[PDB]
Design a protein around this ligand. Structure first.
Ligand SMILES: [Mg+2]
Ligand SMILES: [Mg+2]
Ligand SMILES: [Mg+2]
Ligand SMILES: [Mg+2]
Ligand SMILES: [Mg+2]
Ligand SMILES: [Mg+2]
Ligand SMILES: [Mg+2]
Ligand SMILES: [Mg+2]
Ligand SMILES: [Mg+2]
Ligand SMILES: [Mg+2]
Ligand SMILES: [Mg+2]
Ligand SMILES: [Mg+2]
Ligand SMILES: [Mg+2]
Ligand SMILES: [Mg+2]
Ligand SMILES: [Mg+2]
Ligand SMILES: [Mg+2]
Ligand SMILES: [Mg+2]
Ligand SMILES: [Mg+2]
Ligand SMILES: [Mg+2]
Ligand SMILES: [Mg+2]
Ligand SMILES: [Mg+2]
Ligand SMILES: [Mg+2]
Ligand SMILES: [Mg+2]
Ligand SMILES: [Mg+2]
Ligand SMILES: [Mg+2]
Ligand SMILES: [Mg+2]
Ligand SMILES: [Mg+2]
Ligand SMILES: [Mg+2]
Ligand SMILES: [Mg+2]
Ligand SMILES: [Mg+2]
Ligand SMILES: [Mg+2]
Ligand SMILES: [Mg+2]
Ligand SMILES: [Mg+2]
Ligand SMILES: [Mg+2]
Ligand SMILES: [Mg+2]
Ligand SMILES: [Mg+2]
Ligand SMILES: [Mg+2]
Ligand SMILES: [Mg+2]
Ligand SMILES: [Mg+2]
Ligand SMILES: [Mg+2]
Ligand SMILES: [Zn+2]
Lengths: 59, 86, 158, 135, 52, 134, 122, 50
RNA sequence: CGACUCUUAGCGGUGGAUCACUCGGCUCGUGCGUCGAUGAAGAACGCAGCUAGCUGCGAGAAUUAAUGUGAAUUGCAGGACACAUUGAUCAUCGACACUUCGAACGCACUUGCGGCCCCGGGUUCCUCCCGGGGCUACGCCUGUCUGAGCGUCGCU
RNA sequence: UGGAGCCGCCGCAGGUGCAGAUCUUGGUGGUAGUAGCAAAUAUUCAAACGAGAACUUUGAAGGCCGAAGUGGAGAAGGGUU
RNA sequence: ACCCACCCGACCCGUCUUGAAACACGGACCAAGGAGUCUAACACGUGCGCGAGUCGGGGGCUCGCACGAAAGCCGCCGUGG
RNA sequence: UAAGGCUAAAUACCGGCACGAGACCGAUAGUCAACAAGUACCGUAAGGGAAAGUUGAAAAGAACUUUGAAGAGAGAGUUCA
RNA sequence: CGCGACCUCAGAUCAGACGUGGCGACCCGCUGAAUUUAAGCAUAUUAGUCAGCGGAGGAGAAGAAACUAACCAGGAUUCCCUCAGUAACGGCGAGUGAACAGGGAAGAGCCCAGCGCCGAAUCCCCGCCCCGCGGCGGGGCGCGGGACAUGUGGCGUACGGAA
């Protein structure tokens, strides 16, 4: 994802869980040289990422 | 040596971005500006640089409060009312 | 350097005078502004003289002016006392009163009493309410004039 | 008095201005006293001061101050002139009784400088080329 | 500069003299015609009219 | 002359006023005359031109007695495009040629409620002035 | 399709929130779709949804603040938000009743010695 | 430098966004005087507000 | 005639004078004469379907509401809307809103560390943990509470 | 040639007439297709791509830096290279 | 008035200088720009008005100034110079 | 009549908001700035600080054919040009 | 060795208020040169001028005589015209330099302390009700707090004032 720069991993985790009814293993943020905090979000192994990816639109 | 070879060892910096005025004139060791004097409560302006004076007078910036005050005044500093509705 | 005959003359343009030159391009605009403001003040003080209050007659000082006579600043207290106008009231009927004026000679005093007497004759005091009590003049001398007096009130002519 | 703040002597200039020691401030000590009381209590509005003693080294003073926004002052009509914002910082502008005295204004021949508002204003009047339209 | 002496002030009789001079030559058809005005068919030159 | 001492009569000021005019003000500027026919009927000289009036072009090249329907009003460009007032570009494509509203005459108005109330307001003021003159 | 201020005014507080949420959801999907091409037809909505979102949030704040100043209209001490901001200096003028307080001495003066309407020359 | 503050990093980011050249549809606008960006900064020549 | 060079003229280049325009200045005048801890000026960083700059705005971000207006905006798209309807688009602007620095305020300027009250997950007040909210600058006045003194007394 | 304003006379007014100021700003020559593109040993053959190859790429050969490196990694500085 | 020929004449301008074609300086070439202004005070000359007077300022009265920030008038006409 | 105090008005105003005018300048002028100017650019910094207006009534801004790798041409066309 | 008055002082994230920075054409208070002129220069001049610091308002400052005068006397302040380039200052050189009167623009005058009389007759803050509330006010009612006799309020201030 791209995320709001003010966010903690804790917040992202909580957002990702809330929006997509999902559950996270870990969040792993960085900041793009551009300004937009990117976030890699590992989902817990009960969940498939490609399945949710299809749900949210992207593929 | 005084010249070109000595330009070689300009490896490190005096000033950085001041956080009041925004200029790259915050002297790191002195921990003051030299443009607005940052830590200094009052702004630095001098009467000798009339050109400098004009470069950040009021008009210059957004005047985001001050521009709507002028409007407010014009029509009469009315508060907490609306125009007659439909 | 001076050249053959002329006033060995001293001009005072050694300070930075062009920094303090005062032009007069106002003046017409000024003259009007005063004049409007003047006409407004008349209109506000509706039947009252535009002039102001009545002012005393008074001789100038010094041997030079001496012979002439002006309007003074205000009538003295003795002059009000003799005329029989209470000083605090005199202000309310348009009579200038200064209280710092001495009164040396009795020729200048009786003249200035005469002034106030004459004023009180030809004055038209309106009553406070339209319902008419004492002092307040008749509705005849009221309808026939709620008129302003143009120019200085009872002008002094030397 | 007031010694001239210049490093060593070194008032570089014409030897009229070489003086540093025997020279004396325009305002009084009492005014300085008020000014400092005024500085400190910004909300408070200096009314007037009086003297309470003097050592060799110090003088002492007592500056009467007033809250302009305490209802008892605000509502009392006879004081409520101080609550008007022209009377901000009287002491700083030379307007208390004390700091008035330095300005050098009184009626009569012993003044003339200060025959407009103030010292500065008369000079201003006297050094204006009034340049009329028609001349 | 602004304080160039813009305005120019004239003696009052002289001003009047000019204004008399102009009036006096508002008569004189020659001086009126020469000043260009097509006054060929006008009935009388100091032309005065009813006050309606 | 103009005697009102708050109007301008100053080339630079009038032109700046004109070219930097805001949409709703341009509406008024972009007005156009009614046909003598309508001039008789409504008691109105002219009207702010609009998206789908019927119109003649009076002057220019396209000057003609045909009655084309208005196509759009380009208030930025101070111009209106009209049905068959157009020109073939290099590659055949038709391009709606601009005509200035004032060089056009409205034969048929597009009457909505608001246009109806406008015409009622202008006619009334015209007849007040004729009553005042009489 | 159009969300107006008009109607929202009357609506219940919980009802306004659901509507905002449902727009916030709709905004998300368009933002997703802008990344993946989507379609011009979708990339219109994004502006529309934004402004309708604002239209909702605005109505809510107007309602919350109207209710609030009803609640304090009467009370002496009230929040700075609800106090009337004119201009720093103008909030330190004398009170409107305080600046027409005559001293009893001055009142007595006006009673005894009122300025009189007068004229002259008759 | 590879040891940046956050203040500086954000500053650079905006500078990096400003560099892009004009969108060509801008040229086709009504009252257009703009032909090229003229505020384009090449790292090798001209060296930032720093 | 040959090439080259010089001179004049024609035409073409180079170059941008001249002339003609002017939504800019310069000057004179008129009226009013309003910033800020309810957070100013100024700075920063953001925000457009495609937008870099200028402008415009502030996470409600090329703007919301309201009122006036009455069909556009338009570089292209797309759209809306029934323009016999609070209604496009402008204007006004009284309601709402207003990120971060900045007098600049929890303490620091890393964008780092905190304290104290309440709320949601977390608990089932178990403190933790996470998230949200509200306080936490200095100076000063009027009062309030707690006090200090072999300061001056009184009673015990 | 150009494509939108301009002049004569009588008066008034002026930021009113240039060859020069090592004058100011802009432009253009001769000098001139001249000086010059010489520090640190080195290139060659074939092919590929390609409109086009002394210079790209691949292969083959011949050479150099010669681990105090012309190699492999950072600091500061740059700021997307 | 364009070019060419021939006879006679004929040194490069600016400038400071007693003296410049100078082995005195400035000047490759062209365009545009570019330096005795304005205010005040004095003096003399000249033109006009009035004349033992003259005067206009400053102020005021007449207009929303289209032309007017003019024009006109004033026991202020003369406080005063 | 000092050593305490308040007070409108005629007065000032190269900053501000909003207007009006000119015997002014007319793109090397007029403000540094008619334009994305206190911009680009320079300087560690205080500070310094430009250049730059004009197709046409309308974009009708040159479809198509042809030579060339292309830039460039040759025809054709638009325009009163 | 306590408890209680007061006095002088602290501390509160105590309740409620204010002040802080900006702009700076004009304005008030300080500070304060040197180019320059004098055909040199040091006093003088440039100049109480530039720069420096402070504080304001729509204007500011000033202002209701410890004034002018010397008259047959004027009568707060500010502004203009004049006084006047005058009286005066000055290496009496360069240079500098006001005021009163007179005519106008405007015009407006007032209040304390004190001295005295009046049961502190006064003020602030609480709390309950009625109105009014986008410049927190009126009226009433509370043995509800405090300020205040080390002096609040009415009368009164030199033009006299009180009884
Ligand atoms: Mg008068
Ligand atoms: Mg000296
Ligand atoms: Mg003394
Ligand atoms: Mg009293
Ligand atoms: Mg480099
Ligand atoms: Mg030729
Ligand atoms: Mg050019
Ligand atoms: Mg033309
Ligand atoms: Mg000129
Ligand atoms: Mg030349
Ligand atoms: Mg060669
Ligand atoms: Mg490497
Ligand atoms: Mg010589
Ligand atoms: Mg010689
Ligand atoms: Mg020579
Ligand atoms: Mg020789
Ligand atoms: Mg020489
Ligand atoms: Mg030479
Ligand atoms: Mg020339
Ligand atoms: Mg003569
Ligand atoms: Mg005062
Ligand atoms: Mg140009
Ligand atoms: Mg040009
Ligand atoms: Mg220019
Ligand atoms: Mg040109
Ligand atoms: Mg051109
Ligand atoms: Mg040109
Ligand atoms: Mg042509
Ligand atoms: Mg301040
Ligand atoms: Mg000298
Ligand atoms: Mg000399
Ligand atoms: Mg010397
Ligand atoms: Mg001096
Ligand atoms: Mg200064
Ligand atoms: Mg004042
Ligand atoms: Mg006094
Ligand atoms: Mg006097
Ligand atoms: Mg004389
Ligand atoms: Mg002097
Ligand atoms: Mg008493
Ligand atoms: Zn700074």
């Amino acid at each position: 994802f791209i995320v709001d720069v003010k966010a903690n991993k804790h917040q992202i985790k909580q957002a990702v869980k809330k929006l997509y009814d999902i559950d996270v293993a870990k969040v792993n943020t960085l900041i793009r040289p551009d300004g937009e905090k990117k976030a890699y979000v590992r989902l817990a192994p009960d969940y498939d990422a490609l399945d949710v990816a299809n749900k949210i639109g992207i593929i | 040596t005084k010249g070109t070879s000595s330009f070689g060892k300009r490896r490190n910096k005096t000033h950085t971005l001041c956080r009041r005025c925004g200029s790259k004139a915050y002297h790191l060791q002195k921990s003051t500006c030299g443009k607005c004097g940052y830590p200094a409560k009052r702004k630095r302006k001098y009467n000798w640089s009339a050109k400098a004076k004009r470069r950040n007078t009021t008009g210059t910036g957004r005047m985001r409060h001050l521009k709507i005050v002028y409007r407010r005044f014009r029509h009469g500093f009315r508060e907490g009312t609306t125009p007659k509705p439909k | 350097a001076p050249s053959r005959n002329g006033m060995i003359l001293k001009p005072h343009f050694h300070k930075d005078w062009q920094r303090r030159v005062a032009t007069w391009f106002n003046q017409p605009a000024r003259k009007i502004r005063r004049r409007k403001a003047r006409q407004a003040r008349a209109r506000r003080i509706a039947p009252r003289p535009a002039s102001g209050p009545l002012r005393p007659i008074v001789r100038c000082p010094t041997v030079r002016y001496h012979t002439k006579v002006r309007a003074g600043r205000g009538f003295s207290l003795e002059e009000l006392r003799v005329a029989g106008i209470h000083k605090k009231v005199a202000r309310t009927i348009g009579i200038s009163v200064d209280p710092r004026r001495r009164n040396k000679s009795t020729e200048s005093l009786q003249a200035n009493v005469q002034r106030l007497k004459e004023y009180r004759s030809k004055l038209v005091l309106f009553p406070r309410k339209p319902s008419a009590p004492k002092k307040g003049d008749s509705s005849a001398e009221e309808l026939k004039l709620a008129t302003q007096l143009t120019g200085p009130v009872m002008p002094i002519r030397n | 008095g007031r010694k001239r703040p210049v490093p060593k002597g070194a008032t570089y200039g014409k030897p009229v201005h070489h003086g540093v020691n025997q020279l004396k401030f325009a305002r009084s000590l009492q005014s300085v006293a008020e000014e400092r009381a005024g500085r400190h209590c910004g909300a408070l509005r200096v009314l007037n001061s009086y003297w309470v003693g003097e050592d060799s080294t110090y003088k002492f003073f007592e500056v009467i101050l007033i809250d302009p926004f305490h209802k008892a002052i605000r509502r009392n009509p006879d004081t409520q002139w101080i609550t008007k914002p022209v009377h901000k910082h009287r002491e700083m502008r030379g307007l208390t009784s004390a700091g008035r005295k330095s300005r050098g204004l009184g009626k009569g021949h012993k003044f003339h400088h200060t025959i407009g508002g103030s010292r500065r204003a008369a000079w201003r009047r006297r050094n204006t080329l009034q340049l009329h339209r028609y001349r | 500069k602004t304080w160039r002496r813009w305005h120019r002030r004239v003696n009052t009789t002289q001003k009047r003299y000019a204004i008399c001079s102009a009036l006096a030559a508002s008569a004189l058809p020659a001086l009126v015609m020469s000043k260009g005005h097509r006054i060929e068919e006008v009935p009388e030159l100091p032309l005065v009219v009813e006050d309606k | 002359m103009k005697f009102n001492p708050f109007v301008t009569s100053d080339r630079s000021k009038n032109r700046k006023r004109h070219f930097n005019a805001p949409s709703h003000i341009r509406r008024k500027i972009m007005s156009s005359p009614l046909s003598k026919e309508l001039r008789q009927k409504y008691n109105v000289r002219s009207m702010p031109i609009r998206k789908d009036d019927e119109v003649q072009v009076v002057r220019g090249h396209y000057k003609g007695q045909q009655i084309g329907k208005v196509v759009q009003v380009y208030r930025k460009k101070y111009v209106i495009y009209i049905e068959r007032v157009q020109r073939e570009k290099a590659n055949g494509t038709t391009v709606h040629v601009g005509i200035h509203p004032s060089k056009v005459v409205i034969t048929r108005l597009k009457l909505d409620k608001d246009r109806k109330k406008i015409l009622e307001r202008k006619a009334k003021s015209r007849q007040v002035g004729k009553e005042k003159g009489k | 399709a159009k969300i107006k201020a008009r109607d929202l005014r009357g609506k219940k507080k919980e009802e306004l929130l659901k509507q905002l949420d449902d727009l916030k959801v709709e905004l998300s999907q368009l933002r997703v779709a802008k990344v993946t091409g989507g379609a011009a037809s979708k990339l219109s909505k994004i502006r529309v949804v934004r402004k309708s979102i604002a239209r909702v949030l605005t109505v809510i704040n107007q309602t919350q603040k109207e209710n609030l100043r009803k609640f304090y209209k009467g009370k002496k001490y009230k929040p700075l938000d609800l106090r009337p901001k004119k201009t720093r200096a103008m909030r330190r003028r004398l009170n409107k009743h305080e600046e027409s307080l005559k001293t009893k001495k001055q009142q007595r003066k006006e009673r005894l010695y009122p300025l009189r309407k007068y004229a002259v020359k008759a | 430098s590879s040891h940046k503050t956050f203040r500086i990093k954000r500053f650079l980011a905006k500078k990096q966004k400003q560099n892009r050249p004009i969108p060509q549809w801008i040229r086709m606008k009504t009252g257009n005087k703009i032909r090229y960006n003229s505020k384009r900064r090449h790292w090798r020549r001209t060296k930032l507000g720093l």
